[PDB]
Every structure is written in C-alpha cells, then in structure tokens.
Design a protein around this ligand. Sequence first.
Ligand SMILES: O=Cc1ccc(O)cc1
Ligand SMILES: O=Cc1ccc(O)cc1
Ligand SMILES: O=Cc1ccc(O)cc1
Ligand SMILES: O=Cc1ccc(O)cc1
Ligand SMILES: O=Cc1ccc(O)cc1
Ligand SMILES: O=Cc1ccc(O)cc1
Ligand SMILES: O=Cc1ccc(O)cc1
Lengths: 300, 304
Amino acid sequence: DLTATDLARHRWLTDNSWTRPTWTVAELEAAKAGRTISVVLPALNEEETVGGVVETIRPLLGGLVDELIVLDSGSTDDTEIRAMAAGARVISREVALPEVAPQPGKGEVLWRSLAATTGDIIVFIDSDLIDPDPMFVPKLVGPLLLSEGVHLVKGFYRRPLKGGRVTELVARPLLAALRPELTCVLQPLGGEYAGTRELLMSVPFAPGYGVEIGLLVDTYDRLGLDAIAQVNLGVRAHRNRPLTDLAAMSRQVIATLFSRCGVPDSGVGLTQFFADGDGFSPRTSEVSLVDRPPMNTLRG
Amino acid sequence: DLTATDLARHRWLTDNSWTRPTWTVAELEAAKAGRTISVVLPALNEEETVGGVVETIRPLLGGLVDELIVLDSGSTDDTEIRAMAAGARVISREVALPEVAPQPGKGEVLWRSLAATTGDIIVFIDSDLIDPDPMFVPKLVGPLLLSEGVHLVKGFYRRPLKGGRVTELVARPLLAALRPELTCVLQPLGGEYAGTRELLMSVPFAPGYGVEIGLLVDTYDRLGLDAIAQVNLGVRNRPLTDLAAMSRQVIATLFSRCGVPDSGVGLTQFFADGDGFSPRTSEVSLVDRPPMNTLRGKLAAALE
Ligand SMILES: O=Cc1ccc(O)cc1
Ligand SMILES: O=Cc1ccc(O)cc1
Ligand SMILES: O=Cc1ccc(O)cc1
Ligand SMILES: O=Cc1ccc(O)cc1
Ligand SMILES: O=Cc1ccc(O)cc1
Ligand SMILES: O=Cc1ccc(O)cc1
Ligand SMILES: O=Cc1ccc(O)cc1
C-alpha cells in the first residue's frame, strides 16, 4: 500500500506546502528582522513582458523588497531600456562578475546575480511572464521569513479544474527514479523561487535550462526535504514552447540530474540533419557549458 | 558543426535506413530461403481495432507469413472473437507458457509469444493501430531477408513538415546521454518491429512498457548498430497521465540496462475522500524475464 516516499510526501505537503500563502506584506516586513531581500529577473530579449513584470514588484521597493534587478544576458531588443523605465536596476553579466568571462544560458545569469545582489534572501522571477500577480514575491518569501529551517521556496501555479510536458514526462519521472522524496515538489522546473544567500552561495549552478532542477537537488542532497517549501502563486496557463526547445531543455535537465546523482553523461546532444534527396547529414551538438562553482569560492 | 559521433550516424542512415522500401511481397517470399515468419500481435482489450489489424496481415498467411497470432493478455471485451474472425490464432498467456504464472504488462506478452511460435523471424505489430497498411510486415522483414547481418528492424512513421512526446523528450535525450549512437533510431519505442529468433530467444525481456527500449539496447550492446535497421511505415492521442507512466517505465528499463539504481517508485497521485488520503501509484518494474532459451532450451536448440 503506502511507501516511505508516500508517507514523507504527505507530511511534507502538510508542513511545507501552502495552497493559500496569504501572509500580508506588513507581517512579512515585520518579520525581516534585519534581513534584506533582493529580487532578480533574468532576461534575454523579453521586451514585450519585462516591464510588466517589474511593474508588479516595484510597489514593494523600500518596504518588503530592498532591490529589484534585471540581470540582462545580452539582449538586442528593448529589454534593458524598458526595464529601466519600469523602475528596475539593469545589470549586465559582465558588470555583475567582471573577473569571469560569460558563457551562454540562464543558469549563468542567476549565478552571476549572486555577485551583483546584497540581499540575505534572493527571489528569482522569470521576465517572460504575462500579467504576473503582485503577490508573487510575498508568497515566495513567506516560508523563508516565518518558517524555521527553510532555505528554498518553489512557487507553483494551480492547475485548472478542466503543457508541462518536460515536467511531467522528464523531470518528475527522473526524480521518482533517483530522488523520490522530491516528487513532492509540484513544479520542480519553475522559474519563480526564492532562497537564502547562505544556501545559494554554497551550491554550484548548472548551466542553461538545468539551473532550477540543479538547485533543487543540490539543496535536497545537503538538507533534505525539511529545507524546501512550496507556495501556490495562483492560476497561470501553461506556456507553449516549440518542441525543439523542449527536447533541448529535456536534454539539459537530464545532464544536470545525472551530474548530481552520480550517472555519467556522454556530453552528446541531440542531432539535427541537413535533409534532401541524398539523405540526412547529421550534426550533433556536444556539451560546451560547464557547471559554475559555488559563488563562495569567488565572493564573500 | 560535425562532431565525433556524426560519422557513425551518417554511415548507418546510408546503409541501414529505408525511407522508401522498394520491396515487393513476391521478392521477399523468394528470398525466405527456408526461413519462416511468425507475426505476433499483443492485445489487451482492443476489440475496436484488433480485427482491422489482423485483416491487413491475413492475405500474407500461407505465403510470406507462416503464422499469425494474437497473444491475448486477459481481455474481457470481444478482442478474442474479433481476432479469430479476421483469421488470427488467439493464444492466451497461459497457453503460451503454461507452467509459469503470468505477470502483468506488455513485455510479458511478447516474451511469452517466443514459446508459442516457430518462426525464424518474429514480427510484432501493435493491435491498437487504426487503418494499418498491409505492407507493414513486408517492410519490416525486408532488411532481415535481403540484407546481411541485420537482426532487428524498427518501423518508423513519417515525420511532418513543421504525439511522439515520450520518444522525443524522454527516449531520445536519455539515449543521447547513455547510448549515444542509438539516437539515430527514429522510433526506439515503436511497437512495429521484427527480429531474428536467434536474437529474441537469447535476451532478457523487460517488463511492461519497457520491452521495446530494452530490446533495442540489448541488441545494440550485443550485436551492434549494424545489426539494427529501420524502415518507413508511412503516416495517437493518449492522456498525459498515461504517457507519464509509460515514460517512468522507459526510464526504469534504461536504468536497469545501465546499472543505475532506480528506486522502483512509480508516479503517485494522492486522492482524498471524507475518510482521508490514499496514493495511486503507477506501475514500475525492474525485473526482467530471463532469456526464453533458458526455459525452452530444446525449442531454442531446434530453431538454431
Ligand atoms: O493540502 C493538500 C494535501 C494534498 C495531498 C496530501 O497528501 C496532503 C495535503
Ligand atoms: O485534512 C486535510 C489537510 C490538508 C492539508 C493540511 O495541511 C492539513 C490537513
Ligand atoms: O531569462 C531567461 C534566459 C534564457 C536564456 C538565456 O540564455 C538567458 C536568460
Ligand atoms: O539535514 C537534513 C538532511 C537530510 C537528508 C540529507 O541527505 C542530508 C541532510
Ligand atoms: O499492447 C498490448 C498490451 C498487452 C498487455 C498490456 O498489459 C499492455 C499492452
Ligand atoms: O532518416 C532520417 C530522419 C531524421 C529525422 C527525421 O525527422 C526524419 C528522418
Ligand atoms: O501519471 C501518473 C500516474 C499516477 C498513478 C497511476 O496509477 C498512473 C499514472
């Protein structure tokens, strides 16, 4: 009947998951107790949405939130200037961490943001969200401010009563196989999450689209379920990404899970083919992004 | 840009992949050279489609095809009667291997069929296909009969000019990580494939929905990429929950073949009523059936 995974997951849901994370901004400010909060929006060519995300967070500046930074990854559209006008601080990868040459991918941006921020709590929110809700940051920081022993909070979106394909086909099944207690986390790949500086400075950062799952597993391997919480951010329909983006995402999720769980990885990516009447000429990507070491090895 | 594995991928697609098989039934019959062909359709509650599949293969019986069997896995609908009416012999799991109690899942059915068939070549075709093409069996056996050194033929379906979600997000990326040459196989999880008796009797069979990936990986390791071919068969909507459970078993079987320590924990959904909570957990098995030549050694030796 019941397994040890079932028992732990059920109890974790009752203690470390909030379906209605309704703490008030005032009570969260009162609980800061000298701690400061930084909010980071990673961004690459998100000109249509970045300002709207910033606008939903900026009312918290000077109270709950101490800094609001857009960490730009080399946009060629109007991402940076729209973020400026909307009321954020825009910092490039190069200014965030001058002593290390950048490499591509989302994980690099989040890692570098640790060097550019000062908060005791760092909140990450994706910059591609349409009409996000102003209560995202309060909900994400609640367990960090109020619940002893929590270092990582994952924000999830409620599923309607009536596409998450990488989460449900790749990430959750692989966690079931390799780290089954972590199947408790509803949206392990979600981009809205918060952590303590103590935690985040102490773990390596996986590259590209592996960053979220890498942080989740590294936290678990150091502190177990007790240190991880999740909060319901409300409704939000699934994003529709191209299938080729998704297969590449899956491949990086696999690589990052394997690196943390002791499984070797070939470094071989997926193959694209030149196709014509003479057949299919393969071109296969190979690994070129490295994990970044804990930021404590360079700062603080 | 080109990388190290691309040479092997290019050679294999040139020699072992057929986008447009030219073969006629007549040429294939003339090439059998004393080999016999068994066709096996695994089935569990497929009354709406099984007859249609059988009807497309039945005209080959007595010529290209020597035996046509539906291996029924305990259906309670009209699968059995509809398969017989279309011209298949229907064999239960118990009849196929009477002294061994059945275990659930698709892999069990295919494994058991090895004890109930006599072919030097065995062709598997899913019984849930809609409007299958009568050239499926000819296309699948072509490389076995007309090429040298091929032991496993995987049928693939035509890709569009732009749901295979498990293949493209799970199987192919995992193979890239753990058996990188095998990403060249377009349909690693496909249910339409043919193998030699020599191969099939000698390998363990993975349980459940792991059977196809397990056979592919075992064939690759033991016989190599050149022993695997693929053929275009020409042109389904399952709930995400079912695809996730299938993915979880594909993972378990690949991990078993690599020695990765899979927990055996399935995918769990909690349900609640007035009395409380209880989990519903998807089926996962890490236990292979042993090579059929260990239980049917005399049959295997007769066929060798
Ligand atoms: O509060 C929601 C909840 C859901 C499933 C559980 O097992 C426990 C709690
Ligand atoms: O009775 C159901 C229940 C769900 C979640 C909780 O946290 C507590 C109770
Ligand atoms: O903020 C999202 C992001 C995505 C891809 C990148 O390379 C960098 C940032
Ligand atoms: O401190 C709790 C803890 C739990 C599980 C681990 O593996 C390590 C630490
Ligand atoms: O496709 C055939 C099949 C047989 C037994 C199963 O359990 C599942 C599928
Ligand atoms: O035969 C090779 C091939 C590769 C990719 C496709 O999408 C189709 C065919
Ligand atoms: O995909 C999730 C799942 C959970 C329980 C099951 O029984 C089957 C599937």
